[PDB]
Design a protein around this ligand. Structure first.
Ligand SMILES: CCCCCCCCCCCCCCCCCC(=O)OC[C@H](COP(=O)([O-])OCC[N+](C)(C)C)OC(=O)CCCCCCCCCCCCCCCCC
Ligand SMILES: CCCCCCCCCCCCCCCCCC(=O)OC[C@H](COP(=O)([O-])OCC[N+](C)(C)C)OC(=O)CCCCCCCCCCCCCCCCC
Ligand SMILES: CCCCCCCCCCCCCCCCCC(=O)OC[C@H](COP(=O)([O-])OCC[N+](C)(C)C)OC(=O)CCCCCCCCCCCCCCCCC
Ligand SMILES: CCCCCCCCCCCCCCCCCC(=O)OC[C@H](COP(=O)([O-])OCC[N+](C)(C)C)OC(=O)CCCCCCCCCCCCCCCCC
Ligand SMILES: CCCCCCCCCCCCCCCCCC(=O)OC[C@H](COP(=O)([O-])OCC[N+](C)(C)C)OC(=O)CCCCCCCCCCCCCCCCC
Ligand SMILES: CCCCCCCCCCCCCCCCCC(=O)OC[C@H](COP(=O)([O-])OCC[N+](C)(C)C)OC(=O)CCCCCCCCCCCCCCCCC
Ligand SMILES: CCCCCCCCCCCCCCCCCC(=O)OC[C@H](COP(=O)([O-])OCC[N+](C)(C)C)OC(=O)CCCCCCCCCCCCCCCCC
Ligand SMILES: CCCCCCCCCCCCCCCCCC(=O)OC[C@H](COP(=O)([O-])OCC[N+](C)(C)C)OC(=O)CCCCCCCCCCCCCCCCC
Ligand SMILES: CCCCCCCCCCCCCCCCCC(=O)OC[C@H](COP(=O)([O-])OCC[N+](C)(C)C)OC(=O)CCCCCCCCCCCCCCCCC
Ligand SMILES: CCCCCCCCCCCCCCCCCC(=O)OC[C@H](COP(=O)([O-])OCC[N+](C)(C)C)OC(=O)CCCCCCCCCCCCCCCCC
Ligand SMILES: CCCCCCCCCCCCCCCCCC(=O)OC[C@H](COP(=O)([O-])OCC[N+](C)(C)C)OC(=O)CCCCCCCCCCCCCCCCC
Ligand SMILES: CCCCCCCCCCC
Ligand SMILES: CCCCCCCCCCC
Ligand SMILES: CCCCCCCCCCC
Ligand SMILES: CCCCCCCCCCC
Lengths: 49, 322, 43, 40, 38, 321, 49, 38, 40, 40
């Protein structure tokens, strides 16, 4: 019964990890691109003054 | 009948746009595809809005292998044509007699199959909205209507609440009596217009409830629940619940979805160029252990020098907007 | 008309040429047939 | 047979007329809400 | 009860609980915490 | 054996790396996958080279659903372990007695299946290479060898030309006598070392010919032709494939054409110093179907020195060079 | 036979277009990223003086 | 003729022609035009 | 020791982990050795 | 069928010995080609 609970816990950890990866990697790429755009605009603002 | 202007009710939407913000903006059902896709489109005019398009696809059951399209749209006309690789022609023709009265025609002609037709008249008044349409009309020898006719009415009962109903009438064979069905509608928008509730109670036993919310200026969220009743001689109720969010930025749009049946999904559009974007969509069904992937691209061009410069952003002689 | 009675099974192939002509008659550039049908930036 | 078609047609015509009456009441309803809210 | 779990009332109650929990979560400030300031 | 040092020959490489540049650098057979994938590596040392890994996958038949791995490697030892879901354990153990004399062991133990084993001894002299390898060895009570045994030899005959041969001996059942086969090899490297030719004459009637070329400092190209002989009355089965590789500072591209109607591409884009995004797609024009794969790779570290070094800012000091 | 000659040309145009798109779009993205890196490093070298 | 197309010599001749033409293309200066200067 | 032949192959990966762990200057714990997160 | 197997075993032994002979000739090949190139 302990091994069955371990099996359920491992099979739940796999689904949580792959759900978090699939949902959170493209959102992280989008936020990274937005931050780089804001930083480039700040460098343009520093050059413009 | 004198204090309607004292009440000061606004026009509600259409019945078609009752849960537009959840169904077609936050959720990714209208955007998900499978396989490889390529859509190349060209623009020739902007104020009379003349465009053409080419579409290429492999690996999906819905999209054609090849399709060509063209559309024209000035302020009171909209024409469109479309032809596939199996030589199936689709047409569309909307004519607006005013800004509150539009007549629509939609045809579909393919070889070896019967012709499909659809007619529609739309009317948006000062505080209500009517819509009567007819899908595949025909007449018998004696003069009996065949096919399905749908009519809907939506009324603002207060500056935030709207109530309505929708009737249906289907008579398929023409040698049998027709059917009937009445739905009931509800739409409530908040005073700050930051959250919207909408509910339906359909003719086929269904029950749909939705809630939209604008979290920040870039983030929206939604949740939708569907319950459908049916028979096996025994009752049978099938339920579902979906929750999603949309993040929109200057160069990318993201949508992500969770489902109560064990499905997770995402859709990403990434604008790597002012005239080129790259699409990605992926799904994982945790109840059946399988996945779906799609990857594509969109390319926009122009048909004259002014439109080329405007869509590049350089505008007139390399001088951008202000 | 007689033309509508003679051709009915192939009359629906003249709908997309009509939309192309309607768009072409309103353009100031007025491009040609291959520029209308090609996906490249013809200008 | 034929006698069951009249009941079906009568029921569907009753459904359509009931839908028309509900639509008319929905058009009337904002003034009723205003009257009740102004009375209370 | 397992006999309750075979009823359609189980699916009705489960989806109703999911809908009210999701609506409460969306209107809570946790959804405000889920949006980055950037 | 008096004028070999005046002849001035070099070591011709190994038989396993005979067409390495075409088959495993330019072409994308070792890199293509289907479905979704994720690899999460983690480094603990650099000079004794201790690493771990986690792999997640869905949508392919080749990859497992989950796998954990660990490896250790110093200057004369290499150990590696790997366990999947369903509990299949695989192992590996190399040991170099010298810089040119390596013994290799390779085990794989899964439940409900027989144990697979593989032994190998590799030797690289000043102008030749020998390699003896035994795949699934067994011995009967009588004393008869059962399994596959391969021996190879490759000799440099010119500073640019190398010739060799390979011998096989397979005895599966142990009751029937085994059979033997002989292959013939050839590798020619150009004088400026910008193009390489490789040829094989296999024991199955096969014939493989390859050519590599370095077009620029970032562009390579290759072509390979295979002719197989079969008796379905003799039949000949053949394919010809061509490809190119474009390497840049933060992206690697591979693209391949085929004579059976298949096109394929592979792209790896490094969106971060510790993150990569992989794409691969294929279209088969003869059968009208497609394959797509998307994935990611993540590298992290287990101490502050390696974490700062892989970020690029070596503590308070500058990155400098 | 004339329409049989036209159909094979249409299929050939479809195959050439989709082969060129699949092989050419990721290479174009790679070259674009390299050009942006070269431009950014040239602007840094101009900021150095 | 059409009898030669079903013969086993056709595959050998076709793949030999493909390999010779591909090698001649790769060693040609046409392959140098496919490498951008950047 | 000759009767534990059926489950002796589950000790190969703890041996490689111990071999790596004995050569590190940091010497991390067991949960950190098995954790993907950066986790210095 | 035991006399049928002896021909097979003799053939495979002859194949292995022929492989060893051509390996020895490949080892002595570079000096032979050097002498041929120097004389020619
Ligand atoms: C490892 C371990 O202790 O479990 C192995 C035990 C071994 O027990 P087992 O061998 O009885 O279970 C294997 C299950 N089958 C046979 C169906 C493949 O359990 C597992 O295999 C599942 C748990 C693995 C992951 C444990 C940590 C999960 C949470 C991480 C945070
Ligand atoms: C599983 C993945 C789940 C990921 C969910 C999304 C997480 C988004 C976090 C947003 C943080 C925003 C913020 O404040 O950052 C500003 C900071 C700013 O850092 P900074 O201050 O050094 O940068 C300078 C910025 N200015 C100039 C404005 C001061 O941004 C970052 O450092 C970027 C975040 C790290 C990048 C992503 C790392 C995680 C990637 C996960 C890969 C898979 C791992 C699985 C194991
Ligand atoms: C550079 C790209 C230019 C545009 C490429 C056009 C591709 C046409 C593909 C095609 O015809 O498919 C075969 C198909 C026939 O396909 P099929 O029916 O044999 O395939 C069936 C599908 N499978 C294999 C899956 C069973 O023909 C059509 O699509 C019908 C013609 C459509 C109308 C085309 C009008 C526009 C023509 C544009 C010409 C551009 C010229 C520019 C100079
Ligand atoms: C022709 C299609 C041939 C292949 C399908 C065969 C089946 C035909 C079915 C049929 O006839 O159904 C009758 C249908 C109605 O029937 P139905 O198709 O709904 O159902 C009956 C189908 N059967 C009999 C098979 C059960 O009639 C129509 O809806 C109209 C038919 C003609 C529509 C097409 C032409 C319209 C006019 C075009 C004008 C274009 C103007 C361009 C610009 C000019 C200048 C301004
Ligand atoms: C998701 C949850 C919300 C879904 C939306 C429900 C509210 C929609 C309100 C529609 C506008 C008001 C409709 C109305 O008057 O309903 C009366 C109608 C009909 O009521 P009625 O009183 O006309 O019916 C009895 C009439 N005689 C005596 C002639 C038979 O429906 C209701 O009673 C309310 C809806 C339930 C329908 C069940 C059948
Ligand atoms: C996976 C399907 C499932 O529900 O799990 C059953 C099964 C239970 O397994 P099982 O033992 O019934 O077998 C099912 C068959 N296979 C193994 C093929 C999946 O899945 C799990 O292992 C548990 C998954 C946990 C997550 C469940 C998702 C349901 C909704 C969770 C919240 C999502 C948003 C809710 C609001 C909207
Ligand atoms: C998740 C992991 C991060 C959790 C967290 O607190 O994030 C805040 C973090 C920010 O906090 P943080 O985790 O970086 O820590 C705060 C950093 N300091 C301490 C320096 C101030 O990131 C965000 O703001 C965005 C996270 C978004 C997570 C994914 C959203 C859902 C996407 C799919 C939609 C599915 C439907 C469900 C929604 C309805
Ligand atoms: C914070 C977290 C810190 C601690 C992290 C602990 C990590 C635990 C993993 C250590 C190594 C485990 C080896 C397991 C051997 C394989 C096995 O038993 O099957 C896998 C089993 C699978 O279940 P299973 O063994 O029942 O197999 C079922 C699969 N079929 C039916 C196809 C056979 O479990 C896992 O997937 C466990 C790993 C999940 C991911 C954990 C690491 C990432 C965590 C991120 C946080
Ligand atoms: C030289 C060739 C070997 C000659 C020995 C003959 C012995 C014999 O009778 O045959 C035995 C077997 C065949 O016999 P058998 O085992 O089938 O017979 C046993 C009898 N029964 C089955 C009835 C119980 O064949 C071999 O020769 C196998 C050699 C295996 C060598 C062991 C390698 C050890 C690796 C040590 C380092 C670990 C690194 C990798 C670890 C990975 C862990 C997952
Ligand atoms: C062109 C594509 C295929 C290229 C095949 C390369 C084979 C070259 C032959 C070779 O290396 O043999 C060494 C050759 C061996 O091939 P061989 O032709 O002497 O051996 C064949 C068997 N006998 C002895 C019966 C003739 O070495 C020399 O003897 C020299
Ligand atoms: C031709 C052309 O301009 O394309 C080259 C461009 C990229 O090259 P490029 O134009 O950047 O050339 C490098 C820069 N110069 C001019 C200095 C040498 O695109 C391609 O690679 C063509 C394939 C793209 C996709 C094709 C779709 C069909
Ligand atoms: C083939 C579709 C034609 C649509 C025409 C609409 C106007 C009548
Ligand atoms: C029954 C519908 C949901 C009730 C709760 C609404 C949100 C209230 C604010 C929660 C912080
Ligand atoms: C020293 C034992 C492990 C290495 C293998 C040596 C044998 C070579 C292969 C069999 C001839
Ligand atoms: C299952 C093997 C785990 C490691 C055992 C070796 C311990 C060595 C101790 C030296 C004193």
């Amino acid at each position: 019964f302990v091994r069955n609970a371990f099996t359920k816990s491992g099979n739940l950890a796999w689904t949580l990890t792959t759900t978090a990866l699939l949902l959170g990697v493209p959102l992280s790429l989008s936020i990274l691109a937005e931050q780089q755009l804001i930083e480039m605009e700040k460098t343009f603002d520093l050059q413009s003054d | 009948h004198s204090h309607r202007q004292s009440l000061e009710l606004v026009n509600p939407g259409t019945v078609e746009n009752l849960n537009k913000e959840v169904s077609r903006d936050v959720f990714l059902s209208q955007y998900f595809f499978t396989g490889l896709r390529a859509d190349l489109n060209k623009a020739f005019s902007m104020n009379p809005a003349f465009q053409t398009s080419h579409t290429f696809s492999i690996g999906s059951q819905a999209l054609p292998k090849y399709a060509f399209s063209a559309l024209f749209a000035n302020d009171n006309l909209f024409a469109q044509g479309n032809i596939d690789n199996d030589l199936s022609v689709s047409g569309r023709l909307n004519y607006g007699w005013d800004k509150k009265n539009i007549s629509k025609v939609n045809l579909q002609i393919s070889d070896g199959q019967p012709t499909m037709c659809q007619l529609e008249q739309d009317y948006q008044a000062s505080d209500f909205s009517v819509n009567v349409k007819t899908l595949n009309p025909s007449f018998s020898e004696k003069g009996e209507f065949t096919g399905v006719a749908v009519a809907s009415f939506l009324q603002s009962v207060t500056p935030q609440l709207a109530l309505g109903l929708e009737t249906l009438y289907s008579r398929t064979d023409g040698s049998a009596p027709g059917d009937a069905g009445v739905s009931y509608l509800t739409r409530y928008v908040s005073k700050k217009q930051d959250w919207i509730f909408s509910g339906q109670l359909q003719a086929n036993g269904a029950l749909i409830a939705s809630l939209w919310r604008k979290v920040a200026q870039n983030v929206e969220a939604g949740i939708e629940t569907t319950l459908q009743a049916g028979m096996v001689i025994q009752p049978t109720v099938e339920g579902s619940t979906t929750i999603g969010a949309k993040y929109e930025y200057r160069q990318s749009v993201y949508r992500g979805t969770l489902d109560s049946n064990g499905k997770v999904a995402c859709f990403l559009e990434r604008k790597v160029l002012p005239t080129l974007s790259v699409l990605f969509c992926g799904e994982i069904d945790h109840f059946k252990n399988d996945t779906k992937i799609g990857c594509g691209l969109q390319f926009e061009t122009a048909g004259n020098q002014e439109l080329l410069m405007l869509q590049q952003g350089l505008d007139a002689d390399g001088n951008p907007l202000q | 008309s007689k033309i509508l009675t003679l051709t009915h099974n192939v009359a629906h192939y003249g709908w997309i040429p009509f939309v192309l002509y309607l768009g072409w008659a309103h353009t100031s550039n007025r491009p040609n047939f291959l520029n209308l049908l090609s996906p490249l930036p013809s200008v | 047979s034929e006698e069951e078609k009249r009941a079906h047609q009568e029921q569907t015509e009753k459904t359509l007329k009931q839908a028309a009456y509900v639509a008319a009441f929905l058009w009337v309803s904002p003034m009723i809400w205003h009257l009740v809210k102004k009375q209370w | 009860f397992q006999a309750f779990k075979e009823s359609p009332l189980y699916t009705i109650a489960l989806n109703g609980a999911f809908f009210v929990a999701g609506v409460a979560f969306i209107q809570s400030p946790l959804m405000d915490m889920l949006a980055p300031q950037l």
